Amino acid sequence: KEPCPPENLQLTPRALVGKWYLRTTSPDIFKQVSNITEFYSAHGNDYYGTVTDYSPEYGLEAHRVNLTVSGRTLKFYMNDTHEYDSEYEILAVDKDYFIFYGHPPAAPSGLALIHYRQSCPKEDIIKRVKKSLKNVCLDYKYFGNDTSVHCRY
Ligand SMILES: CCCCCC/C=C/CCCCCCCC(=O)O
């Protein structure tokens, strides 16, 4: 679904550094690719890093990525495949998660992505996520969690 994005939310330099787990998406992508771990390093206001994942069809994958950041949006570039390469806008910022939205080739009608600091986010985090989504005209009921990993949601 299309969000109502907040036009006053901008990415703070270095906010994306470190390890993240992409555990909730809309539409649900987890039958195609799952157990997504991201690691980002700062390059000025940009980032470089890696994304590792499990694919039922391709096996274990490791990808090198770049993020170029421009205000409330960034461009995501991956080396080997470009299924998820797109501009993504920030929808919500929290100490424990970020919510992004874009229209990549893999989900060209729109893809909302929730990146968590914790590998298995607990109920208090999910409650905050639900409120963040409502604030941008989205709804957790249209999202799927990654139930391929050792986490109950
Ligand atoms: C928390 C910082 C997030 C910044 C990046 C926002 C967009 C991310 C897109 C991630 C794509 C997920 C790739 C899945 C693995 C694959 O199929 O290659």
Side-chain angles (χ1 to χ4, degrees), residues 25-37:
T25 71
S26 182
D28 182 353
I29 69 173
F30 295 118
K31 290 320 177 49
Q32 178 171 249
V33 59
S34 67
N35 202 184
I36 303 169
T37 309

Side-chain angles (χ1 to χ4, degrees), residues 11 64 67 72 103-104 144 146 151:
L11 292 163
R64 220 213 36 92
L67 314 180
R72 58 167 330 255
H103 293 82
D146 183 357
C151 188

Side-chain angles (χ1 to χ4, degrees), residues 96-113:
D96 290 317
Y97 61 86
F98 282 74
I99 308 184
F100 282 91
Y101 182 79
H103 293 82
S109 293
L111 182 60
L113 300 173

Side-chain angles (χ1 to χ4, degrees), residues 16 20 22 33 36 38 40 51 53 63 67 74 76 78 81 84 88 98 100 113 115:
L16 308 183
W20 301 95
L22 212 181
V33 59
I36 303 169
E38 300 160 277
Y40 296 115
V51 177
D53 66 77
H63 312 276
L67 314 180
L74 58 81
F76 177 91
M78 166 180 304
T81 165
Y84 289 89
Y88 291 88
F98 282 74
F100 282 91
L113 300 173
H115 307 253

Side-chain angles (χ1 to χ4, degrees), residues 14-108:
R14 317 245 177 166
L16 308 183
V17 295
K19 180 169 45 71
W20 301 95
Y21 304 98
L22 212 181
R23 300 284 194 243
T24 309
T25 71
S26 182
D28 182 353
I29 69 173
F30 295 118
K31 290 320 177 49
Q32 178 171 249
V33 59
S34 67
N35 202 184
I36 303 169
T37 309
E38 300 160 277
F39 181 83
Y40 296 115
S41 297
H43 184 286
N45 289 344
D46 298 328
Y47 300 86
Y48 59 99
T50 61
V51 177
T52 62
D53 66 77
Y54 171 88
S55 167
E57 287 164 308
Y58 308 144
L60 288 160
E61 300 188 291
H63 312 276
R64 220 213 36 92
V65 297
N66 303 288
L67 314 180
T68 68
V69 176
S70 190
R72 58 167 330 255
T73 72
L74 58 81
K75 275 198 91 193
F76 177 91
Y77 300 91
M78 166 180 304
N79 274 2
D80 54 316
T81 165
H82 312 292
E83 281 175 281
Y84 289 89
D85 287 15
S86 207
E87 196 176 330
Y88 291 88
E89 63 186 352
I90 188 67
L91 292 189
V93 168
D94 182 282
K95 61 175 181 73
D96 290 317
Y97 61 86
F98 282 74
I99 308 184
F100 282 91
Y101 182 79
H103 293 82

